[PDB]
Amino acid sequence: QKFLDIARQTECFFLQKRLQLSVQKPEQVIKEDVSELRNELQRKDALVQKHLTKLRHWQQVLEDINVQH
Amino acid sequence: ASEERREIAEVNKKLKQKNQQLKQIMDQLRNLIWDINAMLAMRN
Amino acid sequence: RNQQLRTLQEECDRKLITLRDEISIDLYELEEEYYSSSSS
Amino acid sequence: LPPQYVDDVISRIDRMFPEMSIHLSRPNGTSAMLLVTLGKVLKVIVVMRSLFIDRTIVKGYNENVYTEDGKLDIWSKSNYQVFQKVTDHATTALLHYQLPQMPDVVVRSFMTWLRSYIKLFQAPCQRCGKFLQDGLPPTWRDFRTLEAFHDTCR
Amino acid sequence: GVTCVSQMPKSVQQTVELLTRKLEMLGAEKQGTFCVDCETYHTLMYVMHNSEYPLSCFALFENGPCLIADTNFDVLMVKLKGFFQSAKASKIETRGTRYQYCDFLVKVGTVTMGPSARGISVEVEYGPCVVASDCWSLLLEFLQSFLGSHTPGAPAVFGNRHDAVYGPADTMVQYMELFNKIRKQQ
Amino acid sequence: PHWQTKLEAAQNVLLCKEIFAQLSREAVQIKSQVPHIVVKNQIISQPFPSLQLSISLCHSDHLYVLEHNLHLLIREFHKQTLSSIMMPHPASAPFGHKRMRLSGPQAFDKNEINSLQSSEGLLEKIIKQAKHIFLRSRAAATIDSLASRIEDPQIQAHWSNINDVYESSVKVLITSQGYEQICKSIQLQLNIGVEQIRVVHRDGRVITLSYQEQELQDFLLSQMSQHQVHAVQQLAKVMGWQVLSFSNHV
Ligand SMILES: [Zn+2]
Numbered sequence: 211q212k213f214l215d216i217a218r219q220t221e222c223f224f225l226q227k228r229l230q231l232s233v234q235k236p237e238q239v240i241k242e243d244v245s246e247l248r249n250e251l252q253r254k255d256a257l258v259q260k261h262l263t264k265l266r267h268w269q270q271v272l273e274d275i276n277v278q279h
Numbered sequence: 280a281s282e283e284r285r286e287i288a289e290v291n292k293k294l295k296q297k298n299q300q301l302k303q304i305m306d307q308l309r310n311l312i313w314d315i316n317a318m319l320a321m322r323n
Numbered sequence: 324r325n326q327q328l329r330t331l332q333e334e335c336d337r338k339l340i341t342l343r344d345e346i347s348i349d350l351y352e353l354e355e356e357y358y359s360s361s362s363s
Numbered sequence: 364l365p366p367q368y369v370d371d372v373i374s375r376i377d378r379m380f381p382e383m384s385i386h387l388s389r390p391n392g393t394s395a396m397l398l399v400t401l402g403k404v405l406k407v408i409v410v411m412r413s414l415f416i417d418r419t420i421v422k423g424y425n426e427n428v429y430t431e432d433g434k435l436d437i438w439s440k441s442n443y444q445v446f447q448k449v450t451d452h453a454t455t456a457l458l459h460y461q462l463p464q465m466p467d468v469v470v471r472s473f474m475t476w477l478r479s480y481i482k483l484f485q486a487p488c489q490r491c492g493k494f495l496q497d498g499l500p501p502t503w504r505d506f507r508t509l510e511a512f513h514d515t516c517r
Numbered sequence: 518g519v520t521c522v523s524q525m526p527k528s529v530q531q532t533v534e535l536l537t538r539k540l541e542m543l544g545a546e547k548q549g550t551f552c553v554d555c556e557t558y559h560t561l562m563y564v565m566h567n568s569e570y571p572l573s574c575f576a577l578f579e580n581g582p583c584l585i586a587d588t589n590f591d592v593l594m595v596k597l598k599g600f601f602q603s604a605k606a607s608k609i610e611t612r613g614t615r616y617q618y619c620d621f622l623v624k625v626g627t628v629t630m631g632p633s634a635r636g637i638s639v640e641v642e643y644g645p646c647v648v649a650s651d652c653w654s655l656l657l658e659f660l661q662s663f664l665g666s667h668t669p670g671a672p673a674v675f676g677n678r679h680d681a682v683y684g685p686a687d688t689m690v691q692y693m694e695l696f697n698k699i700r701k702q703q
Numbered sequence: 704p705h706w707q708t709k710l711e712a713a714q715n716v717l718l719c720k721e722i723f724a725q726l727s728r729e730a731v732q733i734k735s736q737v738p739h740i741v742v743k744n745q746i747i748s749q750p751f752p753s754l755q756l757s758i759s760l761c762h763s764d765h766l767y768v769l770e771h772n773l774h775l776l777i778r779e780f781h782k783q784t785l786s787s788i789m790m791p792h793p794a795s796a797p798f799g800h801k802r803m804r805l806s807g808p809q810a811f812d813k814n815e816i817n818s819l820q821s822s823e824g825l826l827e828k829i830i831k832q833a834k835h836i837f838l839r840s841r842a843a844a845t846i847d848s849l850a851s852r853i854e855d856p857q858i859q860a861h862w863s864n865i866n867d868v869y870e871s872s873v874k875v876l877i878t879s880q881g882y883e884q885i886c887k888s889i890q891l892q893l894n895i896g897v898e899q900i901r902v903v904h905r906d907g908r909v910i911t912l913s914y915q916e917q918e919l920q921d922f923l924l925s926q927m928s929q930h931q932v933h934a935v936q937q938l939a940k941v942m943g944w945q946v947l948s949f950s951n952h953v
Pocket residue numbers: 488490491492495512513516
């Protein structure tokens with residue numbers, strides 16, 4: 211188990227070392243930021259659509275319980 | 280690229296503006312869940 | 324009449340609680356989203 | 364999680380520990396408010412939503428549990444300092460046993476903690492005498508090793 | 518909750534102040550003045566007018582049935598005196614100053630068989646729990662700081678059932694035993 | 704029915720006039736360390752230094768959670784009389800509060816019985832609530848504002864779904880950028896009391912609190928710097944790095 215971790219913590223270290231060196235010259239991390247921010251907004255709007263239809267659905271029944279009184 | 284940074288700022292501004300729309304929602308949703316419980320807990 | 328009126332108060336409350344219940348789960352999922360907002 | 368699933372999980376909790384007795388009133392909407400009695404030592408009311416507990420009011424056996432009707436009246440704190448400290452410790456300890464992934468373990472993890480409280484007033488702490496600086500007995504069980512050292516003790 | 522009533526006997530009056538001083542060293546706020554009163558009858562029976570239970574009257578026997586009755590129970594006794602022998606010999610009342618310490622409600626007062634004042638009584642009622650005998654270990658260590666080298670080993674009022682409610686009633690049985698010793702000697 | 708609505712408005716007015724009278728008598732007759740003021744139709748009071756309660760009958764800003772609660776709270780006061788609780792389950796007994804009649808003969812204590820009879824009437828039952836309705840806001844806005852102001856760690860607040868008047872339950876999960884799994888750290892359950900908030904810290908420490916908004920904001924900021932230090936410790940546990948001297952406070 212201890213051999214598992216150290217050989218793995220060394221593996222990610224190599225990639226992590228590349229990441230910062232790969233952060234500098236290319237624009238890819240910025241490009242991933244473009245996608246991630248776009249995805250985050252898309253998820254935000256999708257949550258809204260879930261909100262409105264549910265909120266509108268509740269608005270109907272509450273009004274319905276009022277017309278019946 | 281300088282232009283790419285500008286688009287990120289535009290995306291951030293839109294996202295930041297959308298966040299303002301979102302914060303009001305919680306306050307309203309929060310306020311409603313506050314009010315319903317306070318009104319009900321006092322029920323006779 | 325006192326009997327029939329009490330049912331309405333209990334009836335609307337039952338539906339009223341369910342509104343609070345569903346908003347609670349809806350608020351909880353939304354509440355997390357605002358704090359998750361990155362860079363803003 | 365489904366409302367029916369909540370009852371099954373808690374009903375399963377009662378089986379493991381003979382001393383604990385759990386009552387499921389559910390006065391509010393689909394938020395179980397199970398009541399746990401630890402034999403005769405103490406009572407407690409915990410509110411939980413969708414099988415994720417978020418509060419614990421540890422009222423002693425002496426103190427009343429309801430107010431004017433079957434209403435559970437979770438809020439009313441204990442009139443004794445000892446149970447007040449346990450309330451905070453239960454309030455704090457409830458969190459440390461929260462695993463976001465699994466809903467079943469967190470409830471069970473909290474109960475074995477509460478089950479460890481049956482021996483209150485009778486177990487010395489490993490660090491100093493049973494009775495501490497203030498008027499409180501142990502009132503502090505470690506999360507993993509089940510020690511008895513007080514609030515002032517670490 | 519759970520209590521250990523006992524007596525801790527020159528300068529008997531000075532003992533209370535000295536004993537209170539020992540209590541004061543620990544630190545306990547003066548939250549009132551308790552007043553426990555005992556009454557005595559022939560056939561016997563005792564009605565224990567206890568403080569901190571303003572309504573309860575606590576009628577009791579030597580070893581038998583005990584009932585908890587509101588303050589009006591006394592009015593029955595005075596009116597019922599005809600068939601009984603009321604106020605047969607003397608009424609012993611013990612009044613003292615309440616010293617509630619951080620949920621321990623420990624009180625000490627000089628028992629006064631009016632107006633003699635021959636004894637000292639210590640009340641150490643521990644509110645939290647009703648379970649007492651299988652919880653007795655707590656009270657002793659609280660005592661050891663209060664009094665010196667003569668801790669009462671056990672109150673002896675505990676019959677040790679499988680599941681044990683104690684409540685307030687059996688405490689009055691404990692008070693009577695202390696009063697019995699005081700009455701018997703001097 | 705036109706006659707029905709006309710009568711309903713009158714009944715509401717007669718009840719409303721009673722509500723102000725109950726508050727209006729209570730405010731000046733008794734004192735609770737607060738300077739109530741009486742004007743024609745406005746009972747001005749100052750529960751907090753920064754709050755002004757305009758409970759003003761209006762004849763012919765509106766919370767509607769405090770306003771409605773008055774109408775309902777009065778009934779409980781009205782209900783206490785001529786109720787089913789008063790009557791004795793034993794056929795022969797004087798009329799009395801059922802819980803009270805079983806209190807005296809069951810050896811209840813000096814403190815509990817006194818507490819039950821010490822009901823505060825009407826004004827205290829609402830001022831204390833407004834004394835909590837807005838203290839919640841000052842503690843809710845600060846948490847909401849703090850998330851936007853400080854972006855380095857992310858404050859997270861999971862507000863409880865059952866928060867009755869005179870109490871509110873909080874969750875706070877102060878996690879860093881996106882490292883929820885690798886780094887889960889101090890999360891405190893803040894409790895909004897009537898006068899002062901109450902928190903219990905993750906490690907076990909209990910902090911009572913102050914009531915002012917500024918004091919709360921300081922506490923979160925102090926817990927802010929603590930988490931970033933804890934992030935070092937968590938990485939030390941999971942990174943190839945090993946721990947050295949730790950100083951949780953100072
Ligand atoms: Zn210790």
